[PDB]
Amino acid sequence: QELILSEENKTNIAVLNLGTNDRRNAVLILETALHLVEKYLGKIINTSYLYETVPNYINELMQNLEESKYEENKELIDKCEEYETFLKNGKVDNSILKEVNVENYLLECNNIIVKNDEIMKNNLSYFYNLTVVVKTFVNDPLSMLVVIKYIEELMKIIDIDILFFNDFTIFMKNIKLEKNMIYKILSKYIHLQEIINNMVDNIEFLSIPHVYTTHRYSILLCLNDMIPEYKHNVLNNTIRCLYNKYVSRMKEQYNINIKENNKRIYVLKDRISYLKEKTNIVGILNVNFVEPKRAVQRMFEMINEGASVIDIGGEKISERDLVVPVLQLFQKEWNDAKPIISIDTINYNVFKECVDNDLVDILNDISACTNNPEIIKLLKKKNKFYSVVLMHKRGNPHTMDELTNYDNLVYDIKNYLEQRLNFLVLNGIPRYRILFDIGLGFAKKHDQSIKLLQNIHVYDEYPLFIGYSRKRFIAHCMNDKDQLLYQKNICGGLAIASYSYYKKVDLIRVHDVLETKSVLDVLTKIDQVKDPNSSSVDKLAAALE
Amino acid sequence: QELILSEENKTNIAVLNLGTNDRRNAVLILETALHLVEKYLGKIINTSYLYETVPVNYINELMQNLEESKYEENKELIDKCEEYETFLKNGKVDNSILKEVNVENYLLECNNIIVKNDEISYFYNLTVVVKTFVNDPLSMLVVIKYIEELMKRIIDIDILFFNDFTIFMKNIKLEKNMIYKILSKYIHLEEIINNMVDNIEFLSIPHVYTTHRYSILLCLNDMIPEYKHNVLNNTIRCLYNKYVSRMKEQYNINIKENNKRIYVLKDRISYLKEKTNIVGILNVNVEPKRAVQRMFEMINEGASVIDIGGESKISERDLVVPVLQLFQKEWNDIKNKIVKCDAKPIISIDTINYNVFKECVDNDLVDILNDISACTNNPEIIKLLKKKNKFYSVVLMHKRGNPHTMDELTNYDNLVYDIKNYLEQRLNFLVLNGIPRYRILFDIGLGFAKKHDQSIKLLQNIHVYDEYPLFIGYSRKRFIAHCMNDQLLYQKNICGGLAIASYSYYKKVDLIRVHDVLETKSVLDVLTKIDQV
Ligand SMILES: Nc1ncnc2c1ncn2[C@@H]1O[C@H](COP(=O)(O)OP(=O)(O)OP(=O)(O)O)[C@@H](O)[C@H]1O
Ligand SMILES: Nc1ncnc2c1ncn2[C@@H]1O[C@H](COP(=O)(O)OP(=O)(O)OP(=O)(O)O)[C@@H](O)[C@H]1O
Ligand SMILES: Nc1nc2nccnc2c(=O)[nH]1
Ligand SMILES: Nc1nc2nccnc2c(=O)[nH]1
Ligand SMILES: [Ca+2]
Ligand SMILES: [Ca+2]
Ligand SMILES: [Mg+2]
Ligand SMILES: [Mg+2]
């Protein structure tokens, strides 16, 4: 029916998929896609990691944008009843369009697949995937597909698909819609040329769940980040059981590791970083009757020495007055290879200032955003996203050394950080921008800092940032005296940089950049093997000769 | 009962097993057995590593009161041993004077003994090959039992092979005069005979347990892996391999974890691959007191070994000896603490020159020879590695040319293995000349006739020394710099080295030779601590 045009206010759970081919810009494309979804369909309440897979224009686009009909609510939530119901597949409101049963949908899907498996063989590459969950006002899959496709076309590089829409098992075989009919929907949601019309030659049909959901690995990989316990009526198993069977088959039947080709990504500023492929040095700038010029020159010194990131903090004279001048002075000389800037603050107003004057890229929040959850709001703009380091601790520096009793040290801390991540994600922080920090020395005995490093592998799936530099637990490892201990303590840290390099820790926050960079260069050199076969080829040549 | 004493000058090959249950004194004991073997039986021309398996004052006096052998000692270096070659390819030497038995009878007689035994606790094991002038295995067992007595539980010396012979003699009784007559043939005798008559009951060749005890196969595999006696189903290597795998399949044990290969730096046991020791460099190349306080400094900073050299107008000798004399004297003053009596570093001398090493060794100034020419410059130096009651350990390093030419001598058909096999044959030459295998350390010689990429490649492929005692020197060498992207370069070099310390720690390198002892010690403590669960 034409119920489609009713303002009768409802909320649906819509799982999307976003794709692109530009490697140099995948972030800029895909995050822009996100904003539009946030602006035109409802609220992003889950994302996956950004994955790489093998199977000036936009600046002015944001200035000239149409207002949405519905209003953008930036308020923090801690639960979403709709999402909760979606996941268990309990009853949400009935489907607008007609629903096809299990067996019909199953066969009509084989139709589209073999018809494409035929085309592809007669037709004789980088893929950047990213699932999303939307809490949507939009009334039905088709209405969404329309808006989705108008969104796509506004951006012309990008392919946005619906993967799920509530429990709905919808297959529609032949679809066409009028040119004014399209305008009517696009006006139900947007306050409104040679790009509108185009949609009619497309929009040939509508499959929910999307046809290739179970079939393309990259999809099942993203959905495993978000909704692994999900079991759609169509599907024989949960997202995770499906995902896990797919992987143990590509292994047993192809003798090939699928994760070697499809690579999890995280983002510090705007560029791609492959999870576990490099240990970035994050140089510490601790501002301490303060020559800002010294500080800004130390920033340059550290850049030269090898730092990919600068972590500034001051933690009477206020913190704001200790760091903003410096960042402004720095921002200037750079306009007279650019290092990513991290601010070590828990203070909302200081980050806001820094973020409004574009002086920083990452928030380093040692309270894991629990001092002031509102700070999470500052990591979003219309067209901007900032990344964040969440660190574990207990108490403050006066009391933390005594707050040391844990039911399960390793897993308590990991779960803690996992719940924070979920919280930020549930609030539209992109999963791939959230970095984990175990907080060495913060409410841990020395043995516990070590036990934490010993068990750092529990972070294999996640972007990891750690700070050991110059901490007391290093001294605990050892078997003019004050000068020795500071020589010993820096060298001890160098051992942890080595350990970190082998454990593939993504970022290490250090005082001594020169030193750490030397260590990491030698270790990288040793690992850079020109022929990965040579050891056994050369072994055999010697047995033969 | 007297063809055993026939005047016929003979040269046989014998394989011996040496065992003791004393851990604290394993080295001292087994090496004393080795001295007596060299003195009374012939020439040691092969040895295995020393192993720890799982199934003291009088020795010094003993050494001053030993009857002379009647047979010549000859320390000259040799390059080949024809008898040993024959033994290896199962060729026939002279015919046995003891009556042989055939394979069937041998095997049957062996099983009985092993059954009669299944019917009826740390071990230190070592095998030896002896080019022996002793006429026959029974005669040899007599001399061996005398040796065992001279040393007395603390030592068991068994014969494992003797030429190609297969022998099983039950119910032996040697009349007590017969023993004296045998011992007299080989020794200038000047009480304990009566013990030996009761104890020689039978004679088995091969030894019954040769092929049945893991630790024995373990030792023989180091020495004679390709050997196949008539009585054996396979070569020593195959038999060894099949024993290892039977244990993980039929029993799921993995026997390698119960049995540890050992090397020896000075006089104590080290377990191969269990610790990365720091060797602190002392280049005198100046003032004797400044150098000795630097030695003491390095001890405090964590060095287990000090490596002193005067090479890279005034003799090498004059640079190192006085420093070593002073250090030795000062160390004797600061022995008021007897907690600082067993905390003495092992002293290593970095020299290729015989005169310098000779003086050090005569004056008990050093423990280890660090020969950067792998004893090729003057192999006579190999004689100085053996005294009557002492063995010295040695580092063998690969290089080409000399300091001016080495940077040009850089072509290798197969870098990693060329160097590996080179070191392996140097070791074969030393072992052939009676140096215990477990006292020989391998060093790839980083930076000596290697381009920086070749130095790296050697470090990338360091796993090829997994079975061997490994000593490396990366410290402050040019190639570290080739890795980076004036005092800054100094600093970068030290820090780059500490990366290699890390790598060496994980690769379980046995000794690393460093200038920066304190820094290195700090890195290794931290990595060690992260490893303690
Ligand atoms: N659930 C769905 N979501 C999006 N499009 C759908 C869905 N079901 C059917 N379609 C149809 O697919 C077309 C979407 O175009 P799209 O850009 O995704 O093609 P594509 O990029 O070639 O897809 P693929 O890469 O899977 O071949 C529309 O014409 C629409 O009718
Ligand atoms: N090849 C051989 N080497 C040494 N002894 C042998 C050999 N063949 C037979 N024997 C006999 O074995 C006995 C040697 O006793 P030995 O001290 O080796 O026993 P053990 O120390 O208890 O060790 P094990 O019982 O394992 O042989 C002597 O009776 C000797 O006659
Ligand atoms: N993220 C982070 N920030 C820090 N700031 C100060 C000291 N340590 C740390 C630390 O360990 N992690
Ligand atoms: N064994 C050994 N000795 C050395 N002496 C001087 C310089 N380097 C070295 C070295 O690398 N190894
Ligand atoms: Ca929204
Ligand atoms: Ca001899
Ligand atoms: Mg598509
Ligand atoms: Mg015995």
TrEMBL record, chain A:
GO molecular function list: 2-amino-4-hydroxy-6-hydroxymethyldihydropteridine diphosphokinase activity; ATP binding; dihydropteroate synthase activity; kinase activity; metal ion binding
Binding site for Mg(2+) 3: D512, E515
Sites where the protein binds AMP 4: I162, N202, F205, S207
Binding site for Mg(2+) 2: D159, D161
Keywords assigned: ATP-binding, Calcium, Folate biosynthesis, Kinase, Magnesium, Metal-binding, Multifunctional enzyme, Nucleotide-binding, Transferase
GO cellular component: mitochondrial envelope
Reactions catalysed according to its record: 6-hydroxymethyl-7,8-dihydropterin + ATP = (7,8-dihydropterin-6-yl)methyl diphosphate + AMP + H(+); (7,8-dihydropterin-6-yl)methyl diphosphate + 4-aminobenzoate = 7,8-dihydropteroate + diphosphate
Residues engaged in binding ATP 1: K149, D161, I162, N202, E204, F205, S207, H210, Y212, R216
Occurrences of domain Pterin-binding (ranges): 279-521
Positions with a binding annotation for Ca(2+): E38, G42, E72
Similarity comment: family membership: In the C-terminal section; belongs to the DHPS family.
Protein name in the entry: 7,8-dihydro-6-hydroxymethylpterin pyrophosphokinase-dihydropteroate synthase
Phylogenetic lineage: Eukaryota, Sar, Alveolata, Apicomplexa, Aconoidasida
From TrEMBL, chain B:
Known catalytic reactions: 6-hydroxymethyl-7,8-dihydropterin + ATP = (7,8-dihydropterin-6-yl)methyl diphosphate + AMP + H(+); (7,8-dihydropterin-6-yl)methyl diphosphate + 4-aminobenzoate = 7,8-dihydropteroate + diphosphate
Residues binding AMP 3, per UniProt: I159, N199, E201, S204
Entry binding sites for AMP 2: D158, I159, N199, S204
GO term, biological process aspect, one: tetrahydrofolate biosynthetic process
Amino-acid positions noted as binding Mg(2+) 1 in the UniProt annotation, renumbered to this chain: E148, D156
Pfam families: HPPK, Pterin_bind
Binding site for ATP 1: K145, R153, D158, I159, N199, E201, F202, S204, H207, Y209, R213
SUPFAM superfamilies, per the entry: 6-hydroxymethyl-7,8-dihydropterin pyrophosphokinase, HPPK, Dihydropteroate synthetase-like
Binding site for AMP 4: I159, N199, F202, S204
Record pathway: Cofactor biosynthesis; tetrahydrofolate biosynthesis; 7,8-dihydrofolate from 2-amino-4-hydroxy-6-hydroxymethyl-7,8-dihydropteridine diphosphate and 4-aminobenzoate: step 1/2; Cofactor biosynthesis; tetrahydrofolate biosynthesis; 2-amino-4-hydroxy-6-hydroxymethyl-7,8-dihydropteridine diphosphate from 7,8-dihydroneopterin triphosphate: step 4/4
Protein name: 7,8-dihydro-6-hydroxymethylpterin pyrophosphokinase-dihydropteroate synthase
